[PDB]
Amino acid sequence: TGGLPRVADLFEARRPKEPAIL
Amino acid sequence: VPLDGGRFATSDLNDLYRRVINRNNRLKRLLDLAAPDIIVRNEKRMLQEAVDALLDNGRRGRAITGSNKRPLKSLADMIKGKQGRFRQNLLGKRVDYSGRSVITVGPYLRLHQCGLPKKMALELFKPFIYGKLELRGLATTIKAAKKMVEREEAVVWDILDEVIREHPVLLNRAPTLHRLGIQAFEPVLIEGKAIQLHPLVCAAYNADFDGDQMAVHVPLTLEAQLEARALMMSTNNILSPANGEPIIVPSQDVVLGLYYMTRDCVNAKGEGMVLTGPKEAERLYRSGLASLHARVKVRITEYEKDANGELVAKTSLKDTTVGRAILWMIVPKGLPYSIVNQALGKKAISKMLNTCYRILGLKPTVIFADQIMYTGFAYAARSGASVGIDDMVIPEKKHEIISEAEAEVAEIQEQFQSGLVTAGERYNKVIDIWAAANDRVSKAMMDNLQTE
Amino acid sequence: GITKASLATESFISAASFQETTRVLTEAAVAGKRDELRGLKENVIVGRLIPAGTGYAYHQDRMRRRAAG
Amino acid sequence: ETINKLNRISRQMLQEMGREPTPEELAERMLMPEDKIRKVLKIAKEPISMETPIGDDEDSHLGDFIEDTTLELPLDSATTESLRAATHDVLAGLTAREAKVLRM
Amino acid sequence: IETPITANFREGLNVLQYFISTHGARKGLADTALKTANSGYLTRRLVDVA
Amino acid sequence: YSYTEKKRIRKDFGKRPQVLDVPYLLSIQLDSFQKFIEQDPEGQYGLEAAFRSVFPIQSYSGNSELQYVSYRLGEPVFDVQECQIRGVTYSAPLRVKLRLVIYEREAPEGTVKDIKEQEVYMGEIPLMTDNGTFVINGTERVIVSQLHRSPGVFFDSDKGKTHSSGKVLYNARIIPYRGSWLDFEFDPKDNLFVRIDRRRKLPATIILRALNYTTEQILDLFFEKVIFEIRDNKLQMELVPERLRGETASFDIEANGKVYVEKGRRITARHIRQLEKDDVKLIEVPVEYIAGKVVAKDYIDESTGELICAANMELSLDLLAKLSQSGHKRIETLFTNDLDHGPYISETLRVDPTNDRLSALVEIYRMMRPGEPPTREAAESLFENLFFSEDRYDLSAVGRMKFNRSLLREEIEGSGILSKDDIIDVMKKLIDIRNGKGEVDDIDHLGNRRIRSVGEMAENQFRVGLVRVERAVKERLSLGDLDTLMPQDMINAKPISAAVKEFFGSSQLSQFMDQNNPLSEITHKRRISALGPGGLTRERAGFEVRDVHPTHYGRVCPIETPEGPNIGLINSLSVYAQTNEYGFLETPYRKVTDGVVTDEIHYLSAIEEGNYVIAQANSNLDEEGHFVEDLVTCRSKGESSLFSRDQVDYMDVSTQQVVSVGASLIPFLEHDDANRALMGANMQRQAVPTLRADKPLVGTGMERAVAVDSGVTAVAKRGGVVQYVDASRIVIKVNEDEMYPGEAGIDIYNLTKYTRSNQNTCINQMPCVSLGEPVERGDVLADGPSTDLGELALGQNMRVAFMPWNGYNFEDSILVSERVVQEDRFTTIHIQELACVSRDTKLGPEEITADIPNVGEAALSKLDESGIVYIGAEVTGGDILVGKVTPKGETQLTPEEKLLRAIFGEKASDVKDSSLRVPNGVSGTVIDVQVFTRDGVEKDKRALEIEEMQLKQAKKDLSEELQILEAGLFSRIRAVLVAGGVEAEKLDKLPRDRWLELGLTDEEKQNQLEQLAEQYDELKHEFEKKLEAKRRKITQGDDLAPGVLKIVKVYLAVKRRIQPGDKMAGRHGNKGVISKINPIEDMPYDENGTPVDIVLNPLGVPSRMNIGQILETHLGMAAKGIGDKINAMLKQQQEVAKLREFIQRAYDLGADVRQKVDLSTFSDEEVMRLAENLRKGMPIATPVFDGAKEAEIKELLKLGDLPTSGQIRLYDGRTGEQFERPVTVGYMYMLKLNHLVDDKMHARSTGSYSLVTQQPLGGKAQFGGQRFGEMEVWALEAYGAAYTLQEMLTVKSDDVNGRTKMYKNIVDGNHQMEPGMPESFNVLLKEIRSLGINIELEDE
Ligand SMILES: [Mg+2]
């Protein structure tokens, strides 16, 4: 998404909603 | 403890403890009276409920305090507090030797100090004043020293001048974010009830002048004085801890000052003449002969420390303006003339200070910054900058742009009436044409406003 | 994650600050957990010198004096 | 019991003295000395929860505003510690037997 | 809205244009006033972590 | 033109003719309470309503009934003034007739005895002032109107966030005015659920069972019918040809020897039309089609009498056979379509654990009050008591109306309870929504938002009181004897009084009126709050409601709301708005019939406005007012676009009505960004009144309406000539046309003089009229604080230059000249109420005596012999206002102290000094003193002086009344006698007292003489009784609290001017804080040599977008230009022609505007005064969205002599040299908010401490120190400063040893600390250890 919530999500390590797989 | 009107007020823990004691004693009684099981059991349940209510209330029935609906606070709640997550060192604690008030400007200040109201400094340093007063013998005893300062006798102001001198105070603003939210300054006694805060620091505090209030704290112990001076001191943090870039960068009035100083017009008084140096350039300007900004060749002497820890001198004819020439008098030593020969925007005016720091060190950067602020304000005042209603120029082509862009919408509208375009795609189209129109008018007014 | 990593702390005086106090004190009390301070929050709470800063000299000097002769 | 009686008289006379009966009236109703109303009326009141929330719903609650009046101010303590020095100096000034007699 | 404000501050805005500007204004104030709190929360989490 | 308009006229720019003039700005407040307190013969809300609601109370089958007859409100004990000074509540006694009847056992009814106890008195109820305010404790208080969800039914979505399958859900909510909530909601499985309040969810059908519906009629209710005939053998069906829509053929669809549809072919509109026109009633179907169909009713075998199938059971090919051979021709089934008509209720039933009515009632009762054994009578009682009882449930009128209307009913009024039809209909509607026909409502819509007001809420509280007294009356009627008790005996005072006193005293919506300002009051009184009782919390919602709705248009101000923790949870009422008949919000419009725009006004509610197309406030029409453009910008449904010439239904009345009275005072608002405008109208209410009310130089034209409609001014009740004008009072002689026949002649207005306001500011009225002047009815006879000549002056306009000055205006900081502080124009007057309390301690009573231990003659001087300060004596901090001494016996002194007393021989007192002294730093003059005494304690010397003084002053006042009144009356009799008895010189010889004897010839004039006789005598005795009453109100010992013997209230009036740190702001949302006060010498001046008052910062203008402040500056300058020209021409002394010509020229201005003007007004005595008032500057008006234009401003500047640019050359007052570039200078109206720096400024070294945890606590107006928080600690942590922090949280604060042990070192000249442990943590150890937890301190 973006913004301050993006920062929070990053620092919280939260898995995104529709992630890829490696 | 008692109150006014002979009334009493007490903690709820007394209600709870009382309950526990009464039910326990009653249980002892019911045991000694040989009561049926059904009764003594009920007494045991009630006692368990009472003890539970006393320790942590709310994990059973939530007992209510006497005559009052509100649930009585228990020992667990005594520990917990609330608004957190806040354990009373955490949320905050009231502190002696401190105060606060509305803040004002004080541009005359060096950045190492701050205006402190007379009365405030009197009330804040009170014990120090007492001790000093009787240290010299102006007061027979501490009692008498109070009565002196309470009289506000004429002598004590001179003593306060003494206790203030080397003894820094801590200034803090409300939303403390980074560590620079608290800074230490040197108190300067001031008539009035308002605190005077150095302009260059207004950046770090995020403090505007619209009625923001600041708080003062006195570093009592010696270690706190030296901590305030060698750590929390204003001059010792000139740079953001987030990035090495200077936080003491000049803000607004000052940058309009240096910008108006160093900028060149195409023609004015003094265009194309030659001068021995910055001295007679300023001397030329102040007397009205040469315009602040005019293209001029002047002899200047720059320095470079590019030898080994040693300053090299060199002089030349520089093609510059009278303004740049005047300003160069402020630039210390090793910095090149190149730095002041540009237009000096808020960005460049910062890189000047940064380079000055990483070259000449702390002290020169400090005094430099001070001078930059002073000259900035002064020349900004001389500049007679203002804002009128005609200062904002609307593009002469605006109405026409509006018209054409307005014709687009009706083209697409006719297309929708004719079914050529669907509803949604249509919406996107009209939104796009107007969105383009906005950019058109913007990039019209900017050309007109900028170069015209 | 940060909010999770904050949860891990050896000092129970510190944990009882920003975490749920009621649970922290119990959960520590059963294990007979012995808090040595060390960290900042606990030292602020107990009202002694910060083990950072000017305080580092003290705490270090003491920390070494501890578990020693 | 007395307090209860006192609460009744006001029921007879509340609308009867279409305000409330003066604090001194129930006194004459009752059998006893009649200034005792104020005392009794005062003693019978229950204390207020020290946790009683005061304004803003904020964590300021009533008990937080109760100052310690039993503590002695530092400003005075200093002067006491100074009085010790003053008198000590002064009794050090007299003759040691006069100083002994006065200290005694 | 597909009809942008065709007037600026130097010229006068009319009733509609202003009424429509209002929502943007209030959302601005509310949002910023909230992002204060969010920022604070973030700093808190951060210093607690370190 | 009115009479104060001849004094001064505002030149009004702006085009739009005002079709509707601004109404009473206090409308809501007054009308509401006027409805609460009133006698309404029937049920419309009032005291009558609540009375009728709870009454008549009857005992429990004891046939003892207490009915209510009628009520009255006694005259107020103290009128507003006396009530204010004394501090008592302004209230009326409530006298209510109660009739207690007993029914002889046994009946046919009728009656042993009914006792009619004359009106029992319950409490006194507060009264609302003429201004819409209440006085509770001697203080004006306002109750804010409320905004909540209207009672009725409400259909919502909650799509999205729930369940992440999309799908939404649909829910209905029945919200009563009072009583339990009834909620209906779906789930992902599409099972309909019901919950009472927020409680445990239950399958919907379970409620229908409790209404006595079996399964059969539930199915009958929500489902259609499908008829299955077994006729001959094997399976026909009744086919309604529309049923086949939205489905595919499952088999061969055929009949009538003609095949209509083949299997595998979706039935479309073609097949349907075919079948319809060919009228196929009956079609043969296979036996496998009923394999899935759900049977409607119960089916039994006639022979065996056994149940073949229960209702709502899925039939099978075998079940078909089993009920077929039993002789069943017909089988009814549900009509179920997974698209059109949903099979919800059926499945809901399949989740229903219950069977019969009582089976459901058990589950409902066990839901509401779980854990305890259910009972039949209990279940029935509870359930019937919930939504079906006249007691515990009401939707009221608004509720029943919105309910029915939302249900598409006819009746707009009905029962206040729920009916089976109601619940069932609501369910039907919800199912219809889930099925696709119908839409969900939205909460934020102002049609779903209802406005309450003081009346409604006061009524609710009084109602609560009545239920709680009802319980008591029934409780007493239980055991009652027959002919002894009557109503008073059961019915008390205290309950009712306490309910009402609780409302007005403590509630979020009852607050102290915000009176620092005439705008503040009037903008407080129009206000909306969604908070408080029955509202949301800031913590809960949430952005949608806060946001400005399209429905806010014309109803609520978009741009005036608070900028705090609650935004949009308040707002404000708009200018032209009003409370709807049902309590919604409606705004004035203009009905366009045919093509003409009619000036007839029409009010439309939120929903009424919906489908219509409303035109625009600014739209060009001419002559007749037919629309000039072929298409005009309009808004129809929720949106706005261009609309065809006549499609238009309505048009905005005014170019104002969008905004409020706060924003309507902002000049050039159209040029200001909404944020800064908000801030502007927000701060404008914070302006403290100045010493000299100026007036705006730049205005709107609303300031007049604000000043007058707010009670601050004095408006003439009746027009006439002023007999007498005094700073104290004003006596106006009434005209005969306005005047009533009897009692004769004059209105006397007693002006309010210097007195304490709520904000500790001053409120003082000054006469705006002159001796022997004509006054029109409804004209200002006086000005309140901060009002000038009937307009509103919140501050002062001044000469301001935009230019950076030496950094002294660095951010917003304001740089003001010395001329301003010297002219004392921004000076402000404060009124502080200080009190001294003489209490009773066990040691003894406290004395107010002037005998004070340890004070010099200089200290006791300022007090009289009794111990109270003299009136008028100026005082500063530390001065003794009231001497007070309290017993403390037996010091328990120690060693050397003793020794000391032995040397110096002092009798150190048994009495401590409690005297009230002026707070530190505040300095003012005593304007008044009051003394309250317990009724029965001896009045002290001074208080007695005061009482005699007030008594004599009172007699003088009353005497004045009777004299002016009598003279006024006899002066009429004199005129009536000359009317067919005329004796001139003869009549006025003999004593006036002996006039009434002389009559007149037969005529009505004799009867007029009679009238004047009657009323004369009436006034004559009225005087007597009034003086007696006043004397008593003076002499009565005020009723005090327990423990307090006497109270002395001193009133100080401090005078503060302006100093650096004070907050100042324009109306445009531009703040500032004065920095330095600069000499006139250093002020930038122009070529004319006139300095400038204030130097602003031009850097503040571009960023914050408010360009309105600049336009205001320019136009203000121009106005001051016209003013200056007039001053020069008056100083000329020209004569009338030159002047008048110029003034007119000023008023004409270019063409196209609406103002008009003279030469009506008298060409000499009037015009000259107009000019005289106009020379200070020419007051203009800039209507809000209709305001002036650049061209008009420049044109007016041409009428000046001053430049178009608005900028001129300025010279530094220091160097005398010019300033490069011109700088904008003009006149900007500026407000001094009260953030005064000698309020804000605080300092502490060592103060009082808190007992519970030892921490710094200000108790003395000696301040608790600054709170050092967590972030502030982190700041110290990032720096390396450990010691600063330790001393911060140990010695400076929490350490009880540390603080003092430190202090001694501070004075000793040693800076150290011996910190120890903070008391907080030390307490926490005891608190932790108090539990079963052992917390120790290990080791060493
Ligand atoms: Mg600010």
Tab-separated table of C-alpha atoms and ligand atoms in Angstrom, chain B residues 173 208 210 212, ligand 1:
chain	number	residue	atom	x	y	z
B	173	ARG	CA	8.228	21.893	24.616
B	208	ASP	CA	5.812	28.213	16.253
B	210	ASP	CA	1.308	31.302	17.794
B	212	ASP	CA	3.064	27.628	22.109
G	1	MG	MG	1.645	25.624	16.494
